[PDB]
Amino acid sequence: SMFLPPPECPVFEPSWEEFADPFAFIHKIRPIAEQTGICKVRPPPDWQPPFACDVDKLHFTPRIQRLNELEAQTRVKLRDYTLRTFGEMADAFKSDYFNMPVHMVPTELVEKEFWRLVSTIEEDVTVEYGADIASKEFGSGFPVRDIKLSPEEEEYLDSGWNLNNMPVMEQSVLAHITADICGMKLPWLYVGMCFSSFCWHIEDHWSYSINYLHWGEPKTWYGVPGYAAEQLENVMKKLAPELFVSQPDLLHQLVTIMNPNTLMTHEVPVYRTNQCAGEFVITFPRAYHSGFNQGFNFAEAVNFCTVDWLPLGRQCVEHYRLLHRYCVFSHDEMICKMASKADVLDVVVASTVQKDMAIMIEDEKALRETVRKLGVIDSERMDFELLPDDERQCVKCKTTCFMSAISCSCKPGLLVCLHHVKELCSCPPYKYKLRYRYTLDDLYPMMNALKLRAE
């Protein structure tokens, strides 16, 4: 009645042996956790990274948030509180809201009340929160190299579960991306307060994410398995269509608060958890999630991409094209960069990249045959990776070009991808040029190097 908590998501308590390698561990739990979209991970009892900060010296710009179900909110893009003054505001807010010690309010009650207040139009509750990547003003909650570190800190510098490391690690396919994608490869820092909330979303390029709660009151999560992503979006579009009006940029993606009971009513499977200090939440590819903080806290989260994700990554970019949605990076560029580094690639990585590359090459072969039959005859090699991203998006579908594109002297600087040859200009196709990064004869040896490395 009124609010029925979703069933609990899986919770894992790995031994230190199981825990040591996060990528091995994530791969192990995948058959279970991809069915629920999110899962929780409790590290071994003595895995205890040191949390130490001067609350008077850490400062950040607060963002403001109204809390209305189905109301459009904008995805965060990369006034002032110190961590102390924010904490004081946060604690007083919760304490005053409930007239209870800021810290004796049941999680069940805060959850019940959250879903009441967002549904009630008469209530006009606004809260504040922090969200940004690490900076000199507010750095990672994990140890980073710089300052003389304690031995305790040195211990956790190179941990696989130190989220600063997760990007640059071997089994992380986003590592070799030479592109500047700060928003994606770097951890985000999240100072929370009671009710401050993250709207339903999936990660860019359907990547994984992992979220660590450094300290404070719990974070309440709702998660949906990747297999039900389109079900959820259909429910969303029926109840909040304005969210789906085509977004002009990557800086105007619209998201919203929605009661999980509403999804469950529409046969969307939803799972929940309360993440407490010292615990991880992991989200799987295309797994929708949302949630809110129980009180003053501090979390850190990062995207990552395992070899498992590679085929989904390709599918995601296809899906972005259909939606005319901007890409954070070129998937094909990433694949070719790894192929060009085949000799230093992890061997399982090499094997999986090889498979995606084969698909890429066969798709590219067919697209080029199609545009040749449309009367495009001239061609010239073009180093797409040198162009700023906004200078190599398809005019029509906004995909980031890399393997090839069509240009015309008529429309200087404009490009279309090979799916949209007819969308560039009114000139006849013999005026067009196929701009390509690699010939098919360049590509097969690159793929062969991967095969040799994979043995």
Ligand X SMILES: O=C(O)C[C@@H]1C(=O)Nc2ccc(F)cc21
Residue 123 contacts which entry, Mn ion, Cl ion, Zn ion, none (Cβ below 5-8 A, type-dependent): Cl ion
Q: Across the strands, what pairs with 192?
A: 297
Contact 304, 207 (CB under 8 A): yes
Q: Provide the mask over 130-159, with x wherever binding to ligand X is found by CB under 6 A and - wherever it is not.
A: -x----------------------------
**Judged by CB, which is closer to Cl ion: 127, or 229?**
127
State which amino acid sits at residue 113.
E
Contact 269, 8 (CB under 8 A): no
Q: Provide the mask over 182-211, with x wherever binding to Mn ion is found by CB under 5 A and - wherever it is not.
A: ---------------------------x--
Q: Provide the mask over 357-396, with x wherever binding to Zn ion is found by CB under 5 A and - wherever it is not.
A: -------------------------------------x-x
Smallest distance from Zn ion to CB 421, Å: 9
Query: Does 88 show up as a binding residue in the annotation?
Result: no
Say whether residue 191 binds ligand X (CB under 6 A): no
The three-point CA angle 328-332-338 to 5° equals 105
Cα 246 off chain centre by: 20
Say whether residue 408 binds Zn ion (CB under 5 A): yes
The three-point CA angle 176-335-305 to 5° equals 60
Number of chain positions touching ligand X (CB under 6 A): 11
Q: Which residues contact 260 (CB under 8 A, 6 or more apart)?
A: 6, 222, 270, 272, 290
Residue 389: DSSP 8-state: G
Among 25, 161, 198, 271, binds ligand X (CB under 6 A): 198
Say whether residue 301 binds ligand X (CB under 6 A): yes
Query: Does 205 show up as a binding residue in the annotation?
Result: no
Number of chain positions touching Mn ion (CB under 5 A): 1
Say whether residue 123 binds Cl ion (CB under 5 A): yes
Smallest distance from ligand X to CB 300, Å: 9
Tokens of 378: 């001239």
Smallest distance from ligand X to CB 219, Å: 6
**Judged by CB, which is closer to Mn ion: 93, or 271?**
271
In 28-123 the beta strands, taken as DSSP E runs, fall at 38-41, 59-60, 63-66, 73-74, 81-82
Report the Cα–Cα distance between both ends of the chain, in Å, rounded: 59
CA dist 57 → 51, 53, 81, 135, 142 (Å): 15, 8, 10, 13, 17
Say whether residue 415 binds Zn ion (CB under 5 A): no
Cα 434 off chain centre by: 33
Q: Which residues are known binding-site members for 2-oxoglutarate?
A: 129, 209, 211, 219
List residues near Cl ion by CB under 5 A: 67-68, 123
Q: Which residues are known binding-site members for Fe cation?
A: 201, 203, 289
Q: Which residues are known binding-site members?
A: 129, 201, 203, 209, 211, 219, 289
List residues near ligand X by CB under 6 A: 76, 131, 190, 198, 201, 209, 211, 219, 289, 299, 301
